[PDB]
Design a protein around this ligand. Structure first.
Ligand SMILES: *[C@@H]1O[C@H](CO[C@@H]2O[C@@H](C)[C@@H](O)[C@@H](O)[C@@H]2O)[C@@H](O[C@@H]2O[C@H](CO)[C@@H](O)[C@H](O)[C@H]2NC(C)=O)[C@H](O)[C@H]1NC(C)=O
Ligand SMILES: *[C@@H]1O[C@H](CO[C@@H]2O[C@@H](C)[C@@H](O)[C@@H](O)[C@@H]2O)[C@@H](O[C@@H]2O[C@H](CO)[C@@H](O)[C@H](O)[C@H]2NC(C)=O)[C@H](O)[C@H]1NC(C)=O
Ligand code: HLO
Ligand code: HLO
Ligand code: NAG
Ligand code: NAG
Ligand code: NAG
Ligand code: NAG
Ligand code: FUC
Lengths: 533, 528
């Protein structure tokens, strides 16, 4: 007849899941649980409203649709890019979440891990194979939750002040899912008093904004920010620039036939989703990399102030945070606009291409600011060495967009009462499809965190599987106790003075100092002073 | 002794025979080359010395031009060696000639020394400028002149004829013209004149390179720890007028004519006593009365003239010591002294940056702090003491010299660069100062050869090797012995040699990272 372990009642009604096969053992999975009414038609650009109760049993037996988003076409059929592309049908009916739990269901409350995918706030899906939660759940016996949230214009087009397009609705999607976790995760055996948020890139930036937003802060207890921070120059936008991009997007699709917000939004709602996707990138002020059209907006509501101001003025006592980056944060983004770069050659650029790439990698700054960047990243004993220039531009984009925003956040949190653990992921996967000059690119620690190497269908080495099991143990130890160390080389906390972090690779843990302290002093201390003058 | 009797165009001279460990040399000290710039001739360009009857006694050094005397460490050898060793006087325009004994009968290459001292001090009579060892060992003619310093040499009311400015530079040029007309009477070759100078003397050498009326009076140049494009070497017309105007107010004097007239009534010591209170702020390596850019001696700023110049056919020898700035820190940087380790704090370091980099915006100062802070050890006292010494040294000497060398080389000049890294065993300064500013001169003049001093046997050999380098360059434009070789400095390779007891070691980059900051970025920041 029926299996009781796959039947759960939540506030909205009854659910039916599936028993998932993993190499280590069975897993209960509830995939495609609706947590909000479909944000379609008149509900486009609007905040999510809760899913109204249902009669009967909802089959939560497979991943639901991917929120409508752009699909990468630079390298068609290439494994390195297709792994991030939608693996389900695109639709605006996309607000569903997923719950993995041990089989049989835990009888005592179990710590919960909530995943927020990244993708520059314009892409991503909880259904990607690299976000498969069955291995983490089986190996460490946690409850893992992941949700879909609206991306691109559908999630972050903002006409600030208007009620028809208030902005930040993609973040409200995440917040609603976190509220769903608080009310319902105990029915799956999860502990709502021990909820750990973790995400990568825009997901990590999202995690940080929930830390800084009081209505979200009460919904979790710990945070993990991988290769992303809310104080990044790409993660937020001002109210005026948000309105300019929304108005230009509407102008590019025939709305109005700016002016009035109500008529302008209503005209945008009549446009097919693909039409908005096709023009969303034409609203960027200049050609750039690591810049996204529609991102969270600082409008005094979700973010009372800029993330940097909230970070500096925040009291973080009672909070544990795990932060980190990969070894080569910037390499991936260079083949998407930096002159002379491609994955199919070694991208040994000239001095002129380096100087031109600086303006692409650091867009919308004065020529004096660009000169400061050139001065700091040029080796004046080898000013035109093609190799050194290629690595330097990669460091420019990586430090400016990831490493130094993360370091600044970690330093301010530790100084203001939070316990911080920092890492640098340095293992290049044996199966990595990207060229070797890219090193360890953005986002390629995720598959090890989720235990993907234990998939028998894939071809990781036996040592990479032990590495994956060790990383899953770190993450789950942090979720359980706020400490990645086991109750063995120790992982010391990160503090603003010593600035200690660990290397994550096949070798045992190695303690180092300084997350590129010299470079990050330029980005976090001096260059803001230069932009003010 | 006919070897000590010489007739120049002005009249007859009587010299003196000196002794060296390698034999005797002929010396002619206190030769007048200008009319005494006293009374109504104060602040005025030098007049050629009128011919005289009888025999001028040229057997001892003449008076030192009126200048400030350091009193921070009274009786301390490290400072007394630079203080005047003859009486002070405005009657001070005399030069000295050293020749081999007996006098050369064939044209001999000529070395012309221009002393340093921030354009406010210095004298050709100092013991460390004794030319007898160079002349004996390398058989050259050596000339050194006294030139007016301080307000007497560089007070300027631009546009006026009573204080035109740069008259101390014109003193040097007049001595160079004197060499062209009279050095052959001593056996010297006026067609082979090499200028060499240290600190403000090196800056003066550079300015003679950039001034056409002086450019034809010599053929080669040596710039030691100084450059004409230094932030201290020149001053604008507006600031020169302000500094001169405040000096008159400080000494009780009121129109340029009425103002210079009142300054000319003041005793020389009075102007000396107030010369440093006209500086705009508390600082180090900043001097009140320096050459002014007024379109005459310098038709443009030295850095502009450097960039626009064709320097083909020119050979220069440039260099620095290992620790250019450490010396200046004990004259105003908070927390520094020669009598303790000077392990300063972060707060003193930040305060010392404003003293070491005076008269720049807060943003420019923050850029300095960023580049010279180790953000892994931001408060380490030993690293901060080292860093502030590099700030003063790079900004004032190393990077101005690196800029001049790179531009000259890339524009036709053959450049040889060095770093002097030997600390003298007799050095009285504390060990944390390393090799301070000016402490390569005694080795180039071969002072270690003096048996009355306590240099080592290897230091004597080292001094002989340095005199050979300098004299080779004076003779051929190439310091190399016709080892390993001393390669030329180029804008790309940036090759220089280290000078110490070890054989020559070739290295790349004169603090290339720090000098890109000072020479490339900071000018853009201050103008934006
Ligand atoms: C390295 O690759 C870049 C990118 O070029 C693309 O990828 C290459 C692998 C090859 O397939 C090219 O044909 C592709 O266009 C090269 O830069 C491009 O050069 C071409 C020709 O000069 C020019 O038309 C493009 O605009 C350039 N693109 C960019 C982004 O600069 C680069 O020259 C290659 N380096 C080599 C071959 O040494
Ligand atoms: C190293 O010395 C400096 C200054 O030299 C001292 O000056 C006299 C006080 C003398 O008696 C000797 O100590 C030294 O020659 C010290 O900095 C001074 O500190 C005093 C207080 O002790 C203060 O009043 C002065 O302003 C400071 N001077 C300057 C130029 O800033 C410094 O403390 C000494 N370093 C130590 C003791 O570690
Ligand atoms: N809506 C659009 O037309 C659009 C959206 C986003 N991009 C940027 O996409 C290129 N890009 C640039 C950089 C990355 C880096 N990822 O780590 C990934 C990708 C591709 N993602 O699908 C271009 C156009
Ligand atoms: N006339 C004055 O009062 C006067 C003149 C010159 N100084 C210079 O004295 C300080 N000083 C003394 C000696 C040196 C020696 N440097 O090698 C350098 C410096 C430089 N900057 O402060 C001070 C006062
Ligand atoms: C200032 C103004 O004109 N506001 C109105 C707004 O109230 C209304 O919702 C919209 C659509 O009719 O038209 C506009
Ligand atoms: C909100 C909307 O779509 N329309 C409203 C409607 O009540 C009316 O046309 C007017 C009166 O205030 O304000 C606007
Ligand atoms: C692993 O490699 C083998 C080699 O033939 C192949 O059969 C298999 O499909 C590969 N797996 C993946 C996930 O690429
Ligand atoms: C060293 O030389 C000095 C003169 O420079 C002399 O006074 C002294 O007697 C010598 N010996 C010692 C031990 O200092
Ligand atoms: C239909 C909407 O409401 C009414 C008017 O204010 C406008 O025509 C607007 O288009």
């Amino acid at each position: 007849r029926e299996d009781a372990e796959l039947l759960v009642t939540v506030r909205g009604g009854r659910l039916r899941g599936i028993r998932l096969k993993t190499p280590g053992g069975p897993v209960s999975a509830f995939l495609g649980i609706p947590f909000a009414e479909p944000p379609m038609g008149p509900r486009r650009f609007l905040p999510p409203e809760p899913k109204q109760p249902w009669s009967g049993v909802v089959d939560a037996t497979t991943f639901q649709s991917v929120c409508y988003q752009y699909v990468d076409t630079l390298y068609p059929g290439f494994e390195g890019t297709e792994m991030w592309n939608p693996n389900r049908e695109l639709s605006e009916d996309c607000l569903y979440l997923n719950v993995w739990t041990p089989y049989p269901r835990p009888t005592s409350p179990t710590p919960v891990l909530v995943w927020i995918y990244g993708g520059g706030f314009y892409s991503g899906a909880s259904s990607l194979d690299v976000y498969d939660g069955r291995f983490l759940v089986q190996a460490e016996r946690t409850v893992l939750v992941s949700m879909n949230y609206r991306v691109g214009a559908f999630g972050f087009l903002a006409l600030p002040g208007s009620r028809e397009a208030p902005g930040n609705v993609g973040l409200l999607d995440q917040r609603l899912a976190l509220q769903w976790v608080q009310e319902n995760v105990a029915a799956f055996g999860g502990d709502p008093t021990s909820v750990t948020l973790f995400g990568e890139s825009a997901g990590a930036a999202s995690v940080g904004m929930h830390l800084l937003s009081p209505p979200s802060r009460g919904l979790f207890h710990r945070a993990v920010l991988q290769s992303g921070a809310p104080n990044g120059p790409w993660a937020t936008v001002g109210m005026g620039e948000a309105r300019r991009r929304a108005t230009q997007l509407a102008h590019l699709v025939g709305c109005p036939p700016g002016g009035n917000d109500t008529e302008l939004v209503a005209c945008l709602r009549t446009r097919p989703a693909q039409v908005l996707v096709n023009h969303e990138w034409h609203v960027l002020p200049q050609e750039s990399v690591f810049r996204f059209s529609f991102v969270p907006v600082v409008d005094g509501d979700f973010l009372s102030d800029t993330p940097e101001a909230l970070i500096n003025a925040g009291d973080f006592h009672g909070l544990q945070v795990l932060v980190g980056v990969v070894k080569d944060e910037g390499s991936y983004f260079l083949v998407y606009g930096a002159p002379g770069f491609s994955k199919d050659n070694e991208s040994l650029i000239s001095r002129a291409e380096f100087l031109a790439g600086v303006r692409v990698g650091v867009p919308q700054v004065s020529d004096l600011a660009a000169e400061a960047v050139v001065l700091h990243y040029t080796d004046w004993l080898h000013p035109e060495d093609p190799a050194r220039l290629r690595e330097a531009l990669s460091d420019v984009v990586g430090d400016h967009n990831v490493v130094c925003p993360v370091a600044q956040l970690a330093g301010r949190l530790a100084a203001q009462g939070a316990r911080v653990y920092a890492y640098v992921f340095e293992h290049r996967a044996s199966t990595l499809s990207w060229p070797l000059w890219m090193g360890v690119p953005h986002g390629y620690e995720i598959e090890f965190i989720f235990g993907i190497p234990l998939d028998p269908s894939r071809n990781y080495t036996a040592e990479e599987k032990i590495f994956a099991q060790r990383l899953m143990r770190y993450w789950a130890n942090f979720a359980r106790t706020g400490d990645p160390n086991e109750p063995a080389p120790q992982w010391p906390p990160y503090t603003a003075g010593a600035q200690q972090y660990v290397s994550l690779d096949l070798r045992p843990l190695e303690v180092r100092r300084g997350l590129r302290a010299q470079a990050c002093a330029f980005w976090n201390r001096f260059l803001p002073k230069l932009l003010s003058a």
